[PDB]
């Protein structure tokens, strides 16, 4: 007839269908929290950079040799070096007050017909005088011409 609406609003019943309704899913979640190494797969990872996805599908093939993997690493290092040498031009702060909000940065690669990358950082996650690593976001290529 009528479940207690306060009790239903608990996280345990929000997570019900996904994790807690089935014992195996609950055990998997609890071990994945307590034992990350079991479920860590180097092949695929959340928040993977686009050049690491270039790397995986470039190296994913039947025959792997020293020269092939060396060349794949060299292409990956080229991408990494290109995305690391870029310099910021200008920025905008998403919030009226500097304490909270996000800041969006614009950066130009060292090329003649320049490529522009936009990067966003979160000030809420910043604390204790140090920005959190997960607060920063990876640079994103801007497709339109600038």
């Amino acid at each position: 007839e009528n479940a207690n609406s306060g009790v239903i609003s608990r996280q345990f019943f929000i997570d019900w269908d996904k994790y807690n309704k089935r014992y195996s899913t609950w055990a998997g979640v609890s071990q994945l929290v307590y034992y990350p190494e079991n479920y860590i797969d180097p092949t695929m990872r959340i928040g993977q950079t686009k050049m690491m996805d270039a790397l995986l599908q470039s190296v994913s093939q039947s025959q792997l040799n020293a020269d092939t993997v060396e060349d794949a690493f060299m292409s990956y290092l080229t991408s990494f070096e290109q995305v690391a040498n870029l310099k910021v031009i200008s920025a905008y702060h998403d919030n009226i007050n500097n304490d909270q909000g996000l800041t969006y940065f614009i950066g130009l690669s060292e090329t003649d017909a320049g490529e522009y990358y936009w990067r966003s950082v979160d000030h809420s996650k910043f604390n204790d005088g140090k920005f959190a690593a997960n607060a920063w976001s990876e640079w994103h290529k801007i497709d339109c011409p600038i």
Partner: protein, 86 residues
């Protein structure tokens, strides 16, 4: 080796599948029961403690996890003991 560098996140581990482990199905029963025991008010006929009083007195033991009793015997034991009650 492994223990001499990766041990010590816990003071005392336990074996896979034992009753005392936090991933055991007993731990899942307890965690689930904590949240379930409140879904209805005490006065409601649908209250879990009213509906299944013997469950609230259930022992948590390796015995209750290992022994694969027949379910129909447990349904008979429950109906029989409530009939012997009423």
């Amino acid at each position: 080796g492994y223990n001499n560098q990766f041990s010590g996140r816990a003071s005392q581990y336990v074996a896979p599948g034992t009753v005392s482990s936090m991933f055991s199905p007993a731990a899942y029963l307890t965690e689930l029961y904590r949240e379930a025991r409140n879904l209805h008010a005490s006065d409601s006929v649908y209250y879990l403690d009213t509906r299944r009083p013997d469950l609230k007195s259930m022992a948590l033991s390796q015995q209750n996890m290992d022994i694969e009793l027949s379910t129909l015997s447990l349904s008979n034991e429950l109906l029989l003991e409530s009939i012997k009650t009423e």
